[PDB]
């Protein structure tokens, strides 16, 4: 059993070890961001990539290093080298780029950032599983903000209830 990289979503210099399951938006909400208060001039850092995983919705995106991706034997590693080459070409462009042009690039990154956050929001629930957990939660088939119905996903009911109870109540309405 192996995970597959679908898309590289972002890159950062982050606190060493601020990667994997503790960096999901829902781990962060429950326990705090592992990268909280990281100032790259006051502590050791490492290059981390935000990964959208094949077959997992955007709420499950995690930060990873080249090291953790290789240790976990993830598929889609050709995408890493591509992303690095793309990012190297952008840095180069920025280094010899107008203030105006650099200005428009930075607005585009903010809008993209905003769009990516929408993908982690359940817009509505459209099915539920017959089977419940021992704690009585079904799983829910979720339609995500800003994504087509093809990108709906089954999600753990206990998890979805923490933040999207109103969607649950609308669905059973």
């Amino acid at each position: 059993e192996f995970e597959t990289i679908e898309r590289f979503m972002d890159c950062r210099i982050g606190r060493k070890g601020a990667t994997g399951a503790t960096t999901t938006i829902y781990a962060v909400e429950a326990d705090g961001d592992p990268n909280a208060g990281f100032e790259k001039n006051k502590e050791p850092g490492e290059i981390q990539y935000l990964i959208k995983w094949k077959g997992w919705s955007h709420i499950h995106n995690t930060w990873e290093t080249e090291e953790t991706l290789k240790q976990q034997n993830v598929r889609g590693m050709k995408k890493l080298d591509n992303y690095k080459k793309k990012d190297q070409e952008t840095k180069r462009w920025l280094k010899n780029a107008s203030p105006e042009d650099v200005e428009y690039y930075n607005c585009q990154q903010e809008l993209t950032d905003d769009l990516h956050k929408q993908y982690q929001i359940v817009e509505r629930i459209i099915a539920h599983s017959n089977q419940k957990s021992a704690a009585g939660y079904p799983d829910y088939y979720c339609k995500w903000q800003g994504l087509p119905y093809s990108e709906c996903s089954w999600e753990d009911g206990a998890l979805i209830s923490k933040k999207f109870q109103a969607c649950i109540d609308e669905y059973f309405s």
């Binding site: 994997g20 399951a21 999901t24 781990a27 997992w56 799983d139 753990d156």
Partner: peptide, 7 residues
Amino acid sequence: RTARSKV
């Protein structure tokens, strides 16, 4: 069961 979470 298609639903999972990151552990």
